Amino acid sequence: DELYRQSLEIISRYLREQATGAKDTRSGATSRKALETLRRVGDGVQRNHETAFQGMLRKLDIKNEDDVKSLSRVMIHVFSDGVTNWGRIVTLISFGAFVAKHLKTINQESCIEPLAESITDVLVRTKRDWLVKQRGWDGFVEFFHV
Ligand SMILES: O=C(O)c1cc(SCCc2ccccc2)ccc1NS(=O)(=O)c1ccc2ccccc2c1
């Protein structure tokens, strides 16, 4: 699907840029604009939620490939319950970037791509309809202008 591929490209490229060293660009203007937006906001979110992010990472206890494949079950239970807003969407991806950083530390680089797939699957399978209503990643750029 077009929306899934767009979301997978934005989240993967951001997770790779944070955990490793980007970028080898590819996609359209909206994906390029959304990556820039998420780069600006994501830096601030990872700093402001640093303590929460560290505590949540400690709970998941990731050390092997099996642990990242199980993360999806915890993420869908938290992200589904409650209100849906752009703030919660960026913080979920920003947490993913923080997990991707930890994955580079524990020498599990090959798990960043399935982690990016996991977050995209959590975001799309839970909020696809809300995303279509907000004009997808175009609404994401418009909401995070300031
Ligand atoms: O926006 C989210 O819904 C959100 C979800 C995730 S998925 C990792 C889930 C997890 C929970 C508990 C322990 C380990 C992992 C990551 C970052 C997020 N950031 S958040 O906006 O700061 C937030 C919101 C509600 C929460 C309710 C209970 C516990 C934590 C929460 C965090």
CA of 114 to the centre of ligand 1 (A): 19
> Do residues 115 and 96 make contact, with C-beta atoms less than 8 angstroms apart?
yes
Q: Which of 93, 79, 82, 6 is CA-nearest to residue 49?
A: 93
Q: What is the dihedral angle through the alpha carbons of 85, 86, 91, 92, rounded to the nearest 10 degrees?
A: 70
99 CB near ligand 1 (under 6 Å)? no
**Polymer length in residues for the chain:** 146
CA of 75 to the centre of ligand 1 (A): 7
Q: Would you state the structure tokens that stand for residue 129, as one six-digit string?
A: 């309809």
d(CA 104, CA 117): 17
Q: Which residue is it, tokens 């920003």?
A: 94
Please report the DSSP string for 69-121 in residue order: HHHHHHHHHHHHSS---HHHHHHHHHHHHHHHHHHHHTT-GGGHHHHHHHHHH
Q: What's the CATH number where 78 sits?
A: 1.10.437.10
26 CB near ligand 1 (under 6 Å)? no
CA of 92 to the centre of ligand 1 (A): 7
Within 13 Å, how many C-alpha atoms sit on residue 98's CB side?
24
Three-state secondary-structure class, residue 52: helix
Experimentally, the structure was elucidated by X-ray
> Do residues 60 and 104 make contact, with C-beta atoms less than 8 angstroms apart?
no
Report the nearest-CA residue for atom 23 of ligand 1.
88
DSSP state letter for 4: H
Domain housing 20: 1-144
Report the nearest-CA residue for atom 1 of ligand 1.
88
Amino acid at 51: T
Q: Would you state the structure tokens that stand for residue 1, as one six-digit string?
A: 């699907």
> Do residues 62 and 106 make contact, with C-beta atoms less than 8 angstroms apart?
yes
**What's the number of domains the chain is made of?**
1
d(CA 35, CA 128): 19
DSSP state letter for 64: S
Four-residue CA torsion sign, 13, 21, 32, 138: positive
Stated resolution in angstroms: 2.8
d(CA 92, CA 90): 5
